[PDB]
Enzyme design. Structure first.
Site, short mmCIF file in Angstrom:
data_model
loop_
_atom_site.label_atom_id
_atom_site.label_comp_id
_atom_site.label_asym_id
_atom_site.label_seq_id
_atom_site.Cartn_x
_atom_site.Cartn_y
_atom_site.Cartn_z
N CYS B 14 0.74 -1.21 0.00
CA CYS B 14 0.00 0.00 0.00
C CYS B 14 0.78 1.27 0.00
CB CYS B 14 -1.11 0.09 0.99
SG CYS B 14 -2.07 -1.48 1.08
N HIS B 343 -2.04 1.57 7.15
CA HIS B 343 -2.59 1.53 5.81
C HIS B 343 -2.35 2.95 5.30
CE1 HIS B 343 -4.81 0.12 2.27
NE2 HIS B 343 -5.88 0.92 2.37
#
Lengths: 52, 395, 87
Positions: B14, B343
């Site tokens: 990510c 994230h």
């Protein structure tokens, strides 16, 4: 109460809402002050338009 | 040109995705990368990892070409990641599924990428991120002692949001007041120094790195400074600029204003055409007319950028911004205080309409507004900026 | 059908204590007032679209943990039924 994960002193102010845990009673997130603007923002209408 | 799309994810990449789209959107940077061939070689033979640095750059070429393509949301980051581990032991770290890499600090990735381009191109890449400072170093207790550095410089500016902050704007100010101490009392005591930087020379492209990761001592955990920040779409830096540098920049800015208006004039005239039907041409979908118009627009926009650059004085030096204003093009936001398995999300300003932004949540594309990004409260309530990428106006 | 059914029983333990959706923040959380004087900063989990929900809607919340399990209410009050006399 106290800070949870890490809640800066400067975030919490008189009138500021707080999210606290059910029963472990610690701040996670400061939350924007008051729930009362949201209620009254429904009534508010933006720039109405009529030709003079 | 062509619209940006999904960037292939495969788990624990990510952060890696977000940073790569971010660099791509800088117009200059994209081209130099596209125009990179191994025939031109490294521009510095000062590095024993000179060959590896060429290889990274080539894999980013791959990614960029495919990213642009509306067809391919695949970019194949499987190989690129492998290469990164060899180059730098930071990226060999952290146990995970398949290889060993996991989620990381996008800050760490960004510094390392930076050197990679710097070695291959040389000084050209560098000048486009060099910040000069006239730094005054005055002991708070001994103000009388003042030691001046004029040749102090850095590639990157830190915004400290520790200490009273409520905005990104406030934090840019606090960031200049780094504090360092000095064992010498020949510089007047072991007291904190006020360290005050003014920027006397802007770079074409400005990198903001939030400093905020620290071990919160009292809770014995990783944390990050939770204090609210809000990043306005338009940035202006006129106050931090030393007066003498600032005047020149305000004059330059005016030529730029003229082009921005002719660009938005002929833009409106596009929207009308599409609005109307195709009328007679007989047994044709409207769609075939429409695609053509979309193609004109992307061309016209690159053309308008070139007009700003040509009109700038030949007094202007390469590696200086023309102006004191910058436009927000990419936000690498971070979520979760841990970056051990936090994230990363990416917001990328749309090409075809600068007004519009594409939120790339990895592979998955959703449309958001420029306003939505302004309305952020930052902190942990919502996604909040860790790296901001700012583009000189009209470049 | 089977899909709907299986899911609905699992998620919904009952009774279900209704709320009113005061505002949305885009991060799949909402702020609702329950009938209790403490209000609750809730997750949106499962079912009802985020878009479909507009502020001022009355909502079903799950009793164990308050989460938006759907809507079927639309600010249904007995007062409307009484008035309603199309008959």
């Amino acid at each position: 109460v106290g800070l949870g994960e890490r809640v800066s002193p400067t975030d919490i102010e008189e009138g500021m809402r707080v999210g606290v845990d059910r029963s472990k009673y610690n701040i996670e997130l400061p939350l924007p002050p008051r729930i009362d603007p949201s209620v009254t923002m429904m009534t508010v209408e933006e720039k109405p338009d009529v030709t003079y | 040109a062509q619209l940006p799309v999904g960037f292939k994810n495969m788990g624990n990449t990510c952060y890696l995705n977000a940073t790569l789209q971010a660099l791509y959107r800088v117009n200059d940077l994209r081209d130099m990368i596209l125009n990179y061939n191994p025939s031109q070689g490294v521009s510095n033979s000062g590095a024993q990892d000179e060959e590896i640095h060429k290889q990274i750059v080539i894999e980013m070429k791959r990614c960029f070409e495919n990213l642009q393509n509306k067809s391919f949301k695949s970019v194949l980051p499987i190989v690129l990641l492998n290469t990164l581990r060899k180059c730098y032991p930071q990226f060999a770290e952290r146990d995970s599924q398949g290889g060993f890499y996991k989620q990381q600090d996008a800050e760490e990735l960004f510094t390392q990428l930076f050197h990679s381009m710097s070695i291959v191109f040389g000084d050209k890449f560098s000048e486009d991120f060099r910040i000069q400072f006239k730094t005054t170093i005055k002991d708070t207790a001994n103000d009388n002692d003042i030691t001046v550095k004029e040749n102090e410089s850095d590639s990157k500016l830190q915004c400290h949001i520790s200490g009273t902050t409520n905005f990104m704007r406030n934090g840019l100010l606090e960031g200049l007041n780094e504090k360092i101490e000095k064992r010498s009392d020949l510089t007047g005591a072991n007291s904190i120094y006020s360290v005050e930087k003014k920027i006397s020379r802007l770079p074409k492209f400005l990198t903001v790195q939030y400093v905020r990761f620290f071990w919160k001592r009292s809770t014995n955990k990783k944390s990050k400074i939770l204090r609210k920040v809000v990043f306005p779409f338009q940035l202006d830096v006129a106050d931090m600029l030393t007066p003498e540098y600032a005047a020149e920049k305000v004059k330059v800015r005016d030529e730029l204003r003229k082009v921005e208006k002719e660009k938005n004039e002929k833009e409106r005239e596009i929207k009308r055409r599409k609005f109307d039907p195709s009328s007679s041409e007989n047994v044709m979908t409207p769609r075939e007319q429409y695609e053509t118009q979309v193609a004109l627009n992307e061309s016209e926009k690159d053309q308008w950028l070139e007009e700003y650059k040509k009109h700038f004085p030949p007094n202007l030096e390469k590696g200086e911004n023309p102006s004191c204003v910058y436009n927000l093009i990419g936000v690498i936001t971070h979520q979760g205080a841990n970056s051990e398995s936090g994230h990363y999300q990416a917001f990328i300003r749309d090409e075809l309409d600068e007004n519009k932004w594409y939120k790339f949540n990895d592979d998955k594309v959703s449309v958001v507004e420029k306003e939505k990004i302004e309305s952020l409260a930052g902190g942990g309530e919502s996604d909040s900026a860790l790296i901001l990428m700012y583009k000189g106006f009209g470049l | 059908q089977e899909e709907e059914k299986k899911q609905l029983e699992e998620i919904r333990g009952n009774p279900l204590s209704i709320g009113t959706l005061e505002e949305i923040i885009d991060d799949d959380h909402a702020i609702v007032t329950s009938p209790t004087m403490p209000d609750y900063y809730v997750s949106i989990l499962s079912f009802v679209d985020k878009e479909l929900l507009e502020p001022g809607c009355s909502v079903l919340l799950h009793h164990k943990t308050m989460s938006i399990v759907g809507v079927l209410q639309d600010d249904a009050d007995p007062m409307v039924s009484v008035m309603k006399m199309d008959k």
